[PDB]
Assembly symmetry: C3
Homo-oligomer: 370 residues x 3
Amino acid sequence: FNECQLNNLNALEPDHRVESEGGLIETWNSQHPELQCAGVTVSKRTLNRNGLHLPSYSPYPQMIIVVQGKGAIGFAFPGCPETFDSHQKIRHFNEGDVLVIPPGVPYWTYNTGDEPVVAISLLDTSNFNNQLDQNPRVFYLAGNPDIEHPETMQEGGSVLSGFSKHFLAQSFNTNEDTAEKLRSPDDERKQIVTVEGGLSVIICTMKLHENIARPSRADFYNPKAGRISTLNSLTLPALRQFGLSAQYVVLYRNGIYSPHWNLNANSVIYVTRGKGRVRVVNCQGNAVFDGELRRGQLLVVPQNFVVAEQGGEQGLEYVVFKTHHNAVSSYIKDVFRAIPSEVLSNSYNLGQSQVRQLKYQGNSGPLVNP
Amino acid sequence: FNECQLNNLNALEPDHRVESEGGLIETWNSQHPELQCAGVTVSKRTLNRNGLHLPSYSPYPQMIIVVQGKGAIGFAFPGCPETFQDSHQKIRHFNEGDVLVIPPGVPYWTYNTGDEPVVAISLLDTSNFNNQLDQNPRVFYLAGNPDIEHPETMQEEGGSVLSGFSKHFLAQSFNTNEDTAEKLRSPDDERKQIVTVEGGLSVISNICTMKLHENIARPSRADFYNPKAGRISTLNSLTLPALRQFGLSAQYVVLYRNGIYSPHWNLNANSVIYVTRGKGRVRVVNCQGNAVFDGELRRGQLLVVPQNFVVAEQGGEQGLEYVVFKTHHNAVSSYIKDVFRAIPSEVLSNSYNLGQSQVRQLKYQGNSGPLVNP
Amino acid sequence: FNECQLNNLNALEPDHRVESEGGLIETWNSQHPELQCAGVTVSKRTLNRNGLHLPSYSPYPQMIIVVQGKGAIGFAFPGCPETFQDSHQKIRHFNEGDVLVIPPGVPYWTYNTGDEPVVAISLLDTSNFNNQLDQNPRVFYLAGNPDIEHPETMQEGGSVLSGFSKHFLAQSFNTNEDTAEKLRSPDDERKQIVTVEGGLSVISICTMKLHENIARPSRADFYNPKAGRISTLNSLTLPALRQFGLSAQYVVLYRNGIYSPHWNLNANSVIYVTRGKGRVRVVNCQGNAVFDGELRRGQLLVVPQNFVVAEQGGEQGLEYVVFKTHHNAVSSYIKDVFRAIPSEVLSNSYNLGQSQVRQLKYQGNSGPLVNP
Ligand SMILES: [Mg+2]
Ligand SMILES: [Mg+2]
Ligand SMILES: [Mg+2]
């Protein structure tokens, strides 16, 4: 309605968390005007030593970024035979890798590393495919799930824990003892759990995998300000159907990201490692958000809103979740070399010496080092 | 303004009904929370012997399944010739078991060519991206003085689109006298939207050629078959391409004695259920785990199954045969039985607490089909 | 809340104006029930002699029709080959009668190259699924200090540069602070439309065509020597429009001529009378007339989707523009249908005989344009 008529943005932090015998789940309230406008909601899910996230799915696509830690995920796709014990061709993800969890598709993840895996997943709760509502939803196939988004309700069992065990028994062609097992009416290990001892194993082919970190195929490289890598439907076609792309901006010492904006896409920045200055301006040239942003914090970017950032004394590296398979952007210092001189003159009231300046002066990169 | 955020679902039956000369129109209110979460409404239509349904068009598509009866139907596609001595457009014939797709904005008339009354359940996809108006259902009649089918959209008068135009401007627009054009306002017709054509029509008695209808009933089914619980037929885009432009689909399911429809859910679509024949148990479980609906469901009722919600059905001693509307040209669903045999063995034993023995029992036991029997 | 169950529709009038040093900008309030059911809003822009509209951009696409004057428009498409001491992108000239389309987030600037004011009708497709903000319209100026063009959301207005600081800004571009400070336009009164004393000696995806003329009878598909003609510009003509879901159709209706009752199957429609006057009739699904009355040269009329619209020209004809929210809006007229429905049908339908039936099916000559 007016979801974006916001005259002030925040660097929001998780408003909910759930303890677990396997890991930890931190969620960002979905009702914050910031996330309300962009029509999304993020969730920081962490996997302790040998963490195993029990299967579940959502009525909306999920773009997840593994910043710290590594592991292995498994999809439960329909039809596709369990070519990989009859299990689907399981997948192993690494740090800096990007994945897009299809809607209504149950998924399970296991930590195959020493360091606790920390991942950030963008819940496109306003996506095309989602035909329910804004309020996020998670349907777990197992375990006794502990509410991750209390806003939805304002107990909690899996989907199997809703049918009388006699029914499942007949359905699965088994006894009732095993039936109750599926109902998990007793278990109290919450969402994530740890696999003791270890774990064996040591369209259908639409590579839903892609590492964004790989500093090989970026876009701009300025060894005094940093670089920025983008991921979209071009390299990762799959994204096309879920309409979501991301970028991993890295700002060196005082490195600056020229005032840029997003044409056809909202943005939500996530500070991974670092601390820096960030400014966002709307129509009336207002500084809707002019402050510091560092690790853990999240910042929304209202589509055409203009934003610029500079790495702090410690530096600044983050990831941006945009809502469009092929999100485009442009930095003001580029528009200049696009608009004719005489137009720039009559616009800012500058002689041709200053106009001939802004253009040919500087480099062809939004990454500037003061 | 919370839509699908619901803890309980109510099986619904016709709210309003139109009693016309040669037909009947029963419509379910769109203001029903269960339907609102689906963004659709339904309209049961019954064409009495020799009954004709006055032409009309809606700002959104419609998926209709003729359950009982037969007849002829023709659309008024602009830009299409009268190719198929009269001068009409290639008229199409429909029989029970056929799924009809009425495009948005396109006028259409239907006629019952049989002796028994025709019965079809039209799923009004008002929340389609084609309707640029609003949520409420709208029908524009070209003739007669009909009764408001969906009186909720009004919250009682009516008339064809022409009843608004004066015979003057009308007689002039269509270059005709003040008599013909005068009747074109139908200031007479008490017959309403559906009229009895005593005697019948001698005529019978790509956008133009695109196959819109198809049969979903006939045992030509090739989806899932269990000759102990039933069978399931599907009609998506892959079969009826025309659906893509309208983003819809529907399934036909038959559950024999003790027919059990193992737990399944729709990966990307709101499911509306209408029972054509039968009476059984229907369970719907959301995310919290609890059941938003558990009870008996008899023929003639309607039920909504919100997208990712998990549902399961079982037919009584008399079986269970019903039609299911799915808002998506390619609604994809899956059953838990296929999930277990999809996730690594040791991944299940750590979840619901099981062991290699009983775990290998759920992966290799029973019929690979979702239709099970006790 | 229901937004299209409009009881009575009226003729929208520009209820606002932004006086600019080198021009003027008008806008139809975006709160009108009629304009809301269509999910749009129009903005009448005028560029006096040597008038120049400062660069800007909206999160939604825009379709404009030049109803007066000539000039030039320039875009700043990200990542393009500046084919042309001075390097700028591809400038594009435009005469009157041309229909322009502005991609969202794309900065554009228009300069009047003639002496007579340049007037254009801008359609702000705010309801487009390309605008992930809200319904409220928004303009992002890359320069000057613009006033509020849409106050229905402000209840001053610098540029996206005034938001930054002359310091950081000076750094982000590498230049003295005297430069960057001006890049904020602190003491600028000229507004969004300025005058270029002496004109510009310059004027005298980066491919896809954006504008195309409409007025020309070449794009006409319905000509009635005694009632006027109709010109259509849609997806198949301008492929680019496919990505913005917008179609333009010009209507030339001579005196006493008529546009037989018809309707749009898949789209809303905003009508703007560029010249003439006449009578307009719009019937809703309830078989009633939501709108009925005179329509002069300078008014806006909303025509909901499936609604049936019929209008007869006036003494001095009636040339109006049509904005259809669909890259290829498909319309059809009642008569064209009577020539497609079996002979026996129309019969029992309205109660006619083989005479009156064959009357319409025959007498009704194939053509939406009728000259009574
Ligand atoms: Mg950024
Ligand atoms: Mg079902
Ligand atoms: Mg018109």
